[PDB]
Amino acid sequence: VACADCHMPKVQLENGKVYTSHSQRTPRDMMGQACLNCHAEWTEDQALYAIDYIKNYTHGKIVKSEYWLAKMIDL
Amino acid sequence: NLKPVDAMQCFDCHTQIEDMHTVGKHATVNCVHCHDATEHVETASSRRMGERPVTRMDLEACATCHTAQFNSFVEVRHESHPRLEKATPTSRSPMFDKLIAGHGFAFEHAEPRSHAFMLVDHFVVDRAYGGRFQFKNWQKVTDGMGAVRGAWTVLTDADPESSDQRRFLSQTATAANPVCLNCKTQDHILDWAYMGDEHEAAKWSRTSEVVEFARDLNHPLNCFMCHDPHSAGPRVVRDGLINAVVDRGLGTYPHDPVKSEQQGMTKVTFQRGREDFRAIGLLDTADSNVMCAQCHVEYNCNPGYQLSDGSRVGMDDRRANHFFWANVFDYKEAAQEIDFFDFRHATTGAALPKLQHPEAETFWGSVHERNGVACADCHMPKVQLENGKVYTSHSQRTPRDMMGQACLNCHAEWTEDQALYAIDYIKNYTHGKIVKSEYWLAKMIDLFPVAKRAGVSEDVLNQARELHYDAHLYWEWWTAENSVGFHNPDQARESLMTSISKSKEAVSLLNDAIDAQVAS
Amino acid sequence: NLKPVDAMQCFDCHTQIEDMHTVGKHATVNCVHCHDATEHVETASSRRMGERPVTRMDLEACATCHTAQFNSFVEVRHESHPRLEKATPTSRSPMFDKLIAGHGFAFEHAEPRSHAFMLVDHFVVDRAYGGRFQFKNWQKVTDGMGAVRGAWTVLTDADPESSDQRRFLSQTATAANPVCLNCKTQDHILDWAYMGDEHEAAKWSRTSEVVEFARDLNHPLNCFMCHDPHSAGPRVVRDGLINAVVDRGLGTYPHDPVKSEQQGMTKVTFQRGREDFRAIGLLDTADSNVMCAQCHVEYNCNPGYQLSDGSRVGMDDRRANHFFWANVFDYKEAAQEIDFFDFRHATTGAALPKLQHPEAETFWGSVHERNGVACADCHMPKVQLENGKVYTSHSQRTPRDMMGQACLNCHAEWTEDQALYAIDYIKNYTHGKIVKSEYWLAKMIDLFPVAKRAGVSEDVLNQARELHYDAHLYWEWWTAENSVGFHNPDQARESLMTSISKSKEAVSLLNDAIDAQVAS
Amino acid sequence: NLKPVDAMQCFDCHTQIEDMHTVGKHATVNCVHCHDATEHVETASSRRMGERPVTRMDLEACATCHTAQFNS
Ligand code: HEC
Ligand code: HEC
Ligand code: HEC
Ligand code: HEC
Ligand code: HEC
Ligand code: HEC
Ligand code: HEC
Ligand code: HEC
Ligand code: HEC
Ligand code: HEC
Ligand code: HEC
Ligand code: HEC
Ligand code: HEC
Ligand code: HEC
Ligand SMILES: [Ca+2]
Ligand SMILES: [Ca+2]
To answer: Where, by residue number, does heme 7 bind (chain A)?
Structure first.
């Protein structure tokens, strides 16, 4: 998998010539084309939930890392 | 990957193309994008073609550099209900079968749908080819992109071994002929002489076997129908339109000599063996009124009969490919000027005209046309983008889908709901008068057998038949025309009241004549 | 609170039940859930019933352990418009009154609505009981749960003191008879002998007073119509269906001997006094095609006449409870094989068939049926849950409400809009041909009085009456059938073109005969 | 309106560009779409630039034939 698969996917058209979207943005805007095409077992809400589980966990460890850095700095 | 050819070499023999190509916005577009001419160049002389070069007529030849326009054109409007018969109580002409009896449209006449389907729909309608052609299955009816790639990628022929027009199912007709195809495709643009006249250099003509012609045709509404592929400038290619505007000197706007001069057409003729063969009409401006009038007009594209003596007018006659280029109140005079009618009514025996989608001729003289508004302003507007390169939408559809760009930009005083209400006021009023016109036509038609059987004279029946011509014309124009009055509401109102008047006159004539027979 | 009984004691006398109950998925479900048999056990012998045990037929007897299926079944689809007459310009058969004149359906024939209402709707329709039964007020029409609890909780009888069929309002009919109820309820399953034949052990039969029978019936579409309550296995209970498939050896799929063998039915007969009394059909597989064919078929459930001599065929005759089990092109032969027709047309005098909702017979041979798809795949699919125990929806409704589960799961190439467009292409085309078939039938019907009055011979009128039978059959099948062609579009197209052909033949015959009379 | 230039003349001095341009999917795209080299061609040799040709770096130089990609 590469950056483009999630951030600049092929456009899906009922009737049209396919081209590659150059709107290089979060897959949240185009989950059908940038996620769910590969993850048939998921709805959009489930895929978003999986993203948020990772971001919430990671952000919590960022905040804790900053708490300990700040404690050290202040010493 | 394409390899460019040396255009200078082509230009040595193709001066008309040189003069168009080197000046316009396709000056940098190499011939190889649309022609394979290697063996042609090896074998041609300055006056003889030699090996025929290949010319691409597929729309993908333009989509490579103009994807936005191609994609907007091919989009399917799913809200444009498909295969919806007009002769039903919930559509445009509830009493169509009684009124049109005698004509091939009785077999099927559906509402239009998106442009991608025009060639396939022409091939599969029940009135056209006796049911010979079908979609490969009922699923393929959705496939607009497939239809654009080619009709024969999505259709089947019930009998590839024969080429005659015949019925394959009982309730079908064989109304199609080669003239029809000129408003569905221009794949045959290099194979058809101007007007479909016989010509040594033409593979196809008005008298060809239409089933064989059909098999050679693939793409709907080629992009080059409105845009010259060499100069990229605005044009028309439809022979019948050029013939009306230029040959017959009627002008692009017959009711406005000044606008006709400002927004005019220049006929350009190409030869084969130094004999005129085909023509295009270059437009002074990018005037969608005249571009769309290549097809959205009343026309003849069929055999018929002479008003003078009733004799048959066949496909071989020039009149079988004809643009009347006349509004509803000038139409009777235009049909008399070519001595022509379409069919005899099955019940009344009246000589009658058959009217078809006269949007261009109806739009003339309307408030919008008089103020310089054109079809594209309401039906293919510029796209509005917060951040983007603007292009012209090619979706060609009702303004209901894009009211911001198609109406509200000019009508700042209105919300979308107000603008829709104004449209519906006109369509509701016009439709009410269409229904009333049909009620009176039907009442008149039903009196004909009663009058014949009561012994009413042929003189009185013929009087009623002359009234039928007018009652029919002044009604059918409006079931044929697709705006349900919107494009010219005052003219629709005047015409439909004329229809009703004519029918009422005929009802009174026949009722009195029947009563007099009975009393005697 | 329920107290279990000793089933071993029951099984001593009920070997058939033992063999079914102990083997299936209801082996642990105690008899007390559905039977109160205490006094029965005290008084019965091995061959004599003694006191009759009580058997619960209410759907709540199953809802206690199967709430999801019960709730999905009882849901009211409010988009299924209620009490919507089909003989109107905006519904299925704009010219129904002229075409059906002579038949009781002229009094009222509405579009179907949700299954919860089937028994109440049968009781209150204007054609059934002379207007005797009404909802308690006009508010109760919404109450699907109330109707399921029991018809008589939501309805009133205008005269509880009499039991005769008669008109209570002028424009009503008394078409109901006991056979009708077999497709509305099976509350009478232990009180009705197979086919409704006379039987010492049957309280009710084809010849019963239908008003008295009606008062004994409460619940729509009992859950056990498709599921044996003892084995929980798939079955049918409808006598007419078992008779066609098994007694007459036609098979579950008359056009496919192999599928009939793989997906077959086993008739199981229960006796009273060691004499055959009632029967069920156990299915080899959980085949909703055959489950739904208990009711969604063309049938006789009424008196009629013989084609041979015109004599009356009453409710006492076996033919008054009959599944033709024949597609539209085999139907005429199936009616001839029992020497039967329904009514004489009020205007033309033709012997005519009356067709009713033939969804099962139409579905045979269609692309979906041939590929092993069944009614439930489109009309009662499995539920899709992100996190949940899957069960089968019992909502029984148009796939428009659940396109993801009912179409798009199989048709990955389509969006919901594309799939809807494909449905509408077929329904629009088919409806157009229905309307045209009615136009031609009406034109033929209107010629009958003109021909009679002009002195046209009985020989010619009878010729036209024979054509009327076919013109009618090949049209009415499609206003009766609920998919507007979707279940078999090619067959609908062929049939409706046949209708039009037959009418046109009759119009030409009568018009010529009238003209010849006039000329003489 | 753009007027095409003689790319073969360019290639007499621009072999690296020739080997790239003639093989790929821009082989039919004339140099005038992105370069104004008139005075360059009049004054250059294979060893001396002469007048510096102009090279277009604007995205509109591509948006003309590739509007869908530009707009997205
Ligand atoms: C799908 C499997 C992905 C691939 C492959 C790449 N990225 Fe991604 N990226 C992904 C997600 C789910 C997110 C979070 C987006 C959200 O809305 O929560 C991201 C985030 C980015 C961002 C920040 C986007 C924003 O916040 O608006 C950038 C700049 C980004 N990713 C860049 C990027 C690059 C350069 C990649 C290839 C090396 C790449 N991503 C791969 C999902 C996916
Ligand atoms: C890298 C960050 C990119 C920039 C800047 C531009 N494009 Fe692009 N383009 C990119 C990728 C990853 C792809 C798909 C390649 C693949 O095959 O998977 C593309 C594709 C194109 C195409 C081909 C047709 C298509 O797939 O749409 C064209 C014509 C194209 N890109 C044009 C284009 C233009 C005009 C740009 C400036 C606005 C542009 N690209 C920027 C990556 C990158
Ligand atoms: C003179 C020796 C020629 C050269 C060099 C080229 N063409 Fe030609 N062409 C020539 C003749 C005499 C004709 C018949 C029409 C006429 O003008 O008299 C043609 C025809 C064409 C056509 C039309 C083919 C058709 O199907 O009708 C095309 C598309 C065409 N020629 C293209 C073309 C191209 C692209 C060339 C350079 C590669 C070229 N021709 C060279 C005479 C000569
Ligand atoms: C890329 C190699 C192209 C092919 C193939 C086609 N066209 Fe084109 N077109 C191209 C360019 C670079 C331009 C100029 C863009 C600009 O605005 O400077 C054009 C222009 C047009 C226009 C506008 C002409 C005008 O306003 O005067 C039209 C209507 C047009 N092109 C249509 C068109 C059609 C119908 C094609 C297939 C036959 C087609 N073009 C091919 C690039 C390319
Ligand atoms: C002949 C080649 C045509 C030209 C040029 C134009 N139109 Fe057309 N149009 C044509 C046909 C044969 C059809 C019906 C196609 C079918 O398969 O049924 C149409 C349809 C339309 C519609 C209705 C579209 C819908 O959503 O139902 C509209 C609004 C329309 N046409 C407008 C239109 C305009 C504004 C044109 C000039 C830009 C134009 N058309 C050109 C045939 C042809
Ligand atoms: C241009 C002057 C035309 C000729 C010649 C023919 N048609 Fe046409 N057609 C035309 C337009 C502008 C439209 C859309 C507007 C409308 O009112 O329909 C159409 C539409 C069709 C359709 C679809 C709708 C329908 O009638 O079922 C079919 C099947 C169709 N046209 C067939 C047809 C045949 C068989 C022709 C020769 C007899 C024919 N068309 C000529 C424009 C033009
Ligand atoms: C007539 C019915 C048309 C057909 C068929 C096609 N196009 Fe078109 N095009 C049309 C109009 C009325 C206009 C606008 C002219 C104006 O200046 O108001 C256009 C414009 C173009 C352009 C120019 C850029 C733009 O305005 O978007 C291009 C590049 C163009 N059209 C391309 C195009 C292609 C590729 C077509 C086949 C899919 C096509 N056009 C058909 C009218 C007509
Ligand atoms: C805005 C002032 C308009 C101009 C200029 C043209 N038309 Fe039109 N058209 C207009 C409206 C409001 C309607 C009714 C649409 C609705 O949804 O109620 C129409 C209708 C059509 C149709 C039928 C479209 C459909 O039913 O899907 C066609 C084929 C059509 N118009 C073609 C057309 C042509 C060829 C024009 C220039 C001659 C034209 N229209 C001008 C609004 C406007
Ligand atoms: C609880 C005491 C129950 C009552 C009352 C009814 N049923 Fe039942 N049923 C019950 C169980 C525990 C099971 C087995 C569940 C499992 O999957 O293991 C069932 C099963 C069914 C089935 C499925 C049978 C099969 O797939 O072979 C059906 C169709 C079924 N039950 C229907 C049904 C009906 C119609 C009832 C009322 C007459 C009914 N059940 C009562 C538990 C209970
Ligand atoms: C006889 C007991 C029936 C069986 C078994 C099935 N159906 Fe039925 N259905 C029946 C009636 C009498 C009615 C009309 C009820 C009323 O009060 O009007 C119906 C209705 C339907 C409908 C329409 C529902 C709506 O929303 O309008 C559908 C889609 C339907 N029926 C489908 C269906 C299927 C798929 C069955 C097998 C699982 C089935 N029905 C069984 C009578 C009976
Ligand atoms: C099974 C073979 C049936 C017999 C016997 C009867 N009906 Fe029926 N009915 C049946 C189905 C599958 C449906 C729904 C589909 C449809 O086309 O309606 C119905 C519907 C009704 C309705 C509601 C719709 C309507 O016609 O108004 C009523 C009022 C109704 N049925 C009454 C009725 C009477 C009076 C019957 C005996 C003469 C009768 N039905 C028999 C299935 C079956
Ligand atoms: C025939 C028209 C049916 C009636 C009446 C009822 N059900 Fe049903 N049921 C039906 C089918 C076609 C199926 C699926 C069979 C398959 O395997 O594909 C079912 C399934 C059940 C089950 C099993 C669990 C499940 O799949 O949901 C149960 C427990 C069940 N049905 C119960 C049930 C009840 C309680 C009913 C009255 C409200 C009921 N069914 C009616 C067909 C029919
Ligand atoms: C999917 C391939 C289907 C199968 C298998 C069956 N039917 Fe169907 N049915 C289908 C569609 C698309 C429609 C039209 C629905 C719409 O909203 O347009 C129908 C219609 C019905 C109806 C009428 C439903 C209504 O109008 O509310 C009935 C009563 C019905 N179908 C019954 C039915 C039966 C009994 C089937 C098995 C023999 C059956 N259908 C199969 C799609 C499908
Ligand atoms: C029209 C005159 C063009 C200009 C200016 C540019 N490009 Fe282009 N490009 C053009 C064509 C006709 C094609 C081939 C289309 C086909 O698929 O046959 C291309 C192709 C590309 C591609 C795809 C290349 C590949 O897949 O190998 C890309 C990425 C591309 N073009 C990008 C591009 C950029 C970045 C431009 C501005 C510097 C540009 N193109 C100009 C036509 C034209
Ligand atoms: Ca005409
Ligand atoms: Ca019947």
So the answer is: 35, 38-39
